[PDB]
Enzyme design. Structure first.
Site, PDB file in Angstrom:
ATOM      1  N   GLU A  28       0.765  -1.264  -0.023  1.00  0.00           N
ATOM      2  CA  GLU A  28       0.030   0.025   0.150  1.00  0.00           C
ATOM      3  C   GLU A  28       0.919   1.324  -0.101  1.00  0.00           C
ATOM      4  OE1 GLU A  28      -2.844   0.779  -0.325  1.00  0.00           O
ATOM      5  OE2 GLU A  28      -4.149  -1.405  -0.458  1.00  0.00           O
ATOM      6  N   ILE A  76      -4.062  13.063   4.128  1.00  0.00           N
ATOM      7  CA  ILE A  76      -3.710  11.500   3.355  1.00  0.00           C
ATOM      8  C   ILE A  76      -3.442  10.501   4.458  1.00  0.00           C
ATOM      9  CG2 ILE A  76      -3.543  13.001   1.387  1.00  0.00           C
ATOM     10  CD1 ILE A  76      -0.536  11.464   1.530  1.00  0.00           C
TER      11      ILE A  76
HETATM   12  C1  LIG Z   1       6.620   6.404   0.169  1.00  0.00           C
HETATM   13  N1  LIG Z   1       6.223   7.583  -0.495  1.00  0.00           N
HETATM   14  C2  LIG Z   1       4.824   8.083  -0.614  1.00  0.00           C
HETATM   15  C3  LIG Z   1       3.959   7.748   0.487  1.00  0.00           C
HETATM   16  C4  LIG Z   1       2.544   8.237   0.284  1.00  0.00           C
HETATM   17  F1  LIG Z   1       1.614   7.808   1.146  1.00  0.00           F
HETATM   18  C5  LIG Z   1       2.203   9.496  -0.526  1.00  0.00           C
HETATM   19  C6  LIG Z   1       3.334   9.573  -1.506  1.00  0.00           C
HETATM   20  C7  LIG Z   1       4.521   8.990  -1.527  1.00  0.00           C
HETATM   21  N2  LIG Z   1       5.337   9.722  -2.478  1.00  0.00           N
HETATM   22  C8  LIG Z   1       4.691  10.594  -3.244  1.00  0.00           C
HETATM   23  N3  LIG Z   1       5.143  11.423  -4.256  1.00  0.00           N
HETATM   24  C9  LIG Z   1       4.034  12.134  -4.563  1.00  0.00           C
HETATM   25  C10 LIG Z   1       2.914  12.295  -4.369  1.00  0.00           C
HETATM   26  C11 LIG Z   1       1.905  13.078  -4.951  1.00  0.00           C
HETATM   27  C12 LIG Z   1       2.244  14.623  -5.181  1.00  0.00           C
HETATM   28  N4  LIG Z   1       1.471  15.663  -5.721  1.00  0.00           N
HETATM   29  C13 LIG Z   1       0.333  15.102  -6.144  1.00  0.00           C
HETATM   30  C14 LIG Z   1      -0.553  15.990  -6.789  1.00  0.00           C
HETATM   31  C15 LIG Z   1      -1.149  15.868  -8.327  1.00  0.00           C
HETATM   32  O1  LIG Z   1      -2.222  16.359  -8.741  1.00  0.00           O
HETATM   33  O2  LIG Z   1      -0.395  14.957  -8.726  1.00  0.00           O
HETATM   34  C16 LIG Z   1      -0.818  17.599  -6.414  1.00  0.00           C
HETATM   35  C17 LIG Z   1      -1.870  16.846  -6.033  1.00  0.00           C
HETATM   36  N5  LIG Z   1      -0.174  13.827  -6.184  1.00  0.00           N
HETATM   37  C18 LIG Z   1       0.502  12.995  -5.339  1.00  0.00           C
HETATM   38  C19 LIG Z   1       2.447  11.400  -3.318  1.00  0.00           C
HETATM   39  N6  LIG Z   1       0.954  11.493  -2.781  1.00  0.00           N
HETATM   40  C20 LIG Z   1      -0.215  10.616  -2.686  1.00  0.00           C
HETATM   41  C21 LIG Z   1      -1.049  11.017  -2.443  1.00  0.00           C
HETATM   42  C22 LIG Z   1      -0.872  12.320  -2.191  1.00  0.00           C
HETATM   43  C23 LIG Z   1      -1.612  13.594  -1.840  1.00  0.00           C
HETATM   44  F2  LIG Z   1      -1.744  14.576  -2.853  1.00  0.00           F
HETATM   45  F3  LIG Z   1      -3.052  13.158  -1.755  1.00  0.00           F
HETATM   46  F4  LIG Z   1      -1.389  13.973  -0.636  1.00  0.00           F
HETATM   47  N7  LIG Z   1       0.436  12.773  -2.348  1.00  0.00           N
HETATM   48  C24 LIG Z   1       3.178  10.540  -2.666  1.00  0.00           C
END
Ligand SMILES: CNc1cc(F)cc2c1[nH]c1ncc(-c3cnc(C4(C(=O)O)CC4)nc3)c(-n3ccc(C(F)(F)F)n3)c12
Ligand code: NA
Length: 189
Positions: A28, A76
């Protein structure tokens, strides 16, 4: 909320007694790094098994948004229901970890938050300067949820091989500090 996850864990994470749920904890978290690689922002992922059977997943993506002007990262990591009517989410992993540390490197700053059983110990806060970006999650599965807390190299490695084929050029390192073993999974397409 997360209390229901702690009460009926197998319903959310998978069977907590046959190894399914324990390794789903890793998969996950990793799925978020895989999504970040599919989006084109992450080229390195590592998964480390520590000697205390905790797990660190680290990637070199954009970092979770902070969006403080409760942080987006706290949402999140702690909210089970996104609203309205497959994949349970990292909030379930948080709920079932007796401690979890989230470290975000983004926009010149290091942000961190610590939780116990999914409950924040304090707000996400900035703790220094960085030159990188990415996200790191270090979680300790709750021994009150999983009677067998021990990870299987073979189970993780089998799934990481499948994942590697989906992202050409993205290295996924599996490091087992219990044994000193490490293996880089990298598919070139
Ligand atoms: C172990 N790494 C890890 C765990 C986790 F658990 C969430 C993330 C993660 N690495 C990530 N790297 C990037 C995002 C990310 C960043 N920006 C977006 C956005 C886009 O539109 O692409 C601006 C909203 N989505 C995802 C991220 N995240 C996964 C979910 C999320 C968020 F945005 F919901 F907080 N960030 C994770
Ligand atoms: Na990055």
């Amino acid at each position: 909320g997360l209390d229901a996850v702690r009460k009926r864990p197998g319903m959310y994470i998978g069977d907590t007694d046959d190894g399914t749920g324990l390794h789903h904890m890793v998969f996950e978290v990793v799925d978020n790094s895989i999504d970040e690689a599919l989006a084109g922002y992450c080229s390195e992922i590592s998964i480390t098994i520590h000697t205390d059977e905790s797990i660190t997943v680290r990637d070199n993506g954009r970092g979770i948004p902070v969006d403080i002007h409760v942080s987006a990262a706290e949402v999140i990591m702690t909210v089970l229901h996104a609203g309205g009517k497959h994949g349970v989410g990292v909030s379930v992993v948080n709920a079932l970890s007796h401690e979890l540390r989230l470290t975000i490197r983004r926009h010149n700053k290091v942000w961190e938050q610590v939780y116990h059983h999914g409950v924040p110990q304090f707000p996400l806060r900035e703790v220094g300067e960085t030159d990188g970006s990415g996200t790191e999650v270090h979680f300790k599965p709750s021994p009150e949820t999983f009677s067998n807390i021990h990870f299987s190299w073979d189970i993780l490695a089998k799934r990481i091989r499948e994942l590697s084929f989906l992202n050409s050029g993205v290295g996924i390192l599996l490091r087992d500090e219990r044994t000193g073993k490490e293996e880089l999974f990298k598919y070139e397409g």
